[PDB]
Design a protein around this nucleic acid. Structure first.
Length: 190
RNA sequence: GAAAAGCCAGUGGCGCGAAGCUACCGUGUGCCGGAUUAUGACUGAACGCCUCUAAGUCAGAAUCCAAGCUAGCAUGCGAC
């Protein structure tokens, strides 16, 4: 179209190592590996000196191009921090008659949900990324789902949220489920 | 002629009748994976925040395409 643009650059910390080839960026830290492709119009992705600056750049701009770059910046920040501490999503039971019972299938990584709305069959759904579900249930509140990838950890929690909707009548009145209560957190020990 | 064994009545009529055929008037059998939609979602800009969407992306239907089933390209072909 028209107009022009220039590069926007983020300091990469020394404690995170990055290596780039093509427009695919590999971010590595002690919490694992995260690899994404930021392909877009007039947009190249390169590492302008390791431990100094991570660069996402474009040499031409229009509304479409500019929109992608801000998004790219947000996404790469999540990866840099995600390889050093990981992200944790927190989900809290609400039930009005049915105790919902959560456990982990360690082999064939999935989270199993018993007694959603009187079902005889335990319904379970996989775990996306090498995410692990840890339960600090206490009273029967918190389920804390921890992995490196912000998107995939959130997606694993999200499929549970879709499942626990009550659709015979009236989602509003029937609050049986475990619902995403987070968009999640910094870090901590325990 | 009768006996006996049969003939004719456009298949004489009647009761039964195998073999054959046939009846949700008899029986038995009739397939499950994937890709997706609707739709809810993720991460997330545009719109520092935020949003299912712009880029990328997930789950998902009596759908669709295999799987499967029927013709077998007679003017496709292989091996022998």
């Amino acid at each position: 179209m028209k107009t022009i643009l220039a590069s926007e650059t983020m300091e990469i910390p020394e404690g995170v190592t990055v290596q780039v080839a093509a427009k695919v960026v590999t971010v590595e830290g002690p919490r694992g590996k995260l690899t994404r492709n930021f392909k877009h119009l007039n947009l190249d992705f390169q590492l302008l000196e390791g431990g100094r600056k991570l660069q996402v750049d474009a040499w031409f701009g229009t509304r479409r191009t500019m929109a992608a770059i801000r998004t790219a910046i947000s996404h790469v920040q999540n990866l840099i921090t995600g390889v050093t501490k990981g992200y944790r999503y927190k989900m809290r039971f609400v039930y009005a008659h049915f105790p919902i019972n959560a456990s982990i299938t360690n082999s064939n990584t999935a989270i199993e949900i018993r007694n959603f709305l009187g079902e005889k069959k335990v319904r379970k759904v996989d775990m996306l990324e090498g995410v692990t579900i840890l339960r600090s249930e206490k009273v029967k509140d918190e389920l804390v789902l921890d992995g490196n990838d912000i998107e995939l950890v959130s997606r694993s929690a999200a499929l549970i949220n879709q499942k626990c909707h009550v659709k015979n009548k009236d989602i509003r009145k029937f609050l049986d489920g475990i619902y995403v209560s987070d968009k999640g957190t910094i870090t901590e020990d325990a």
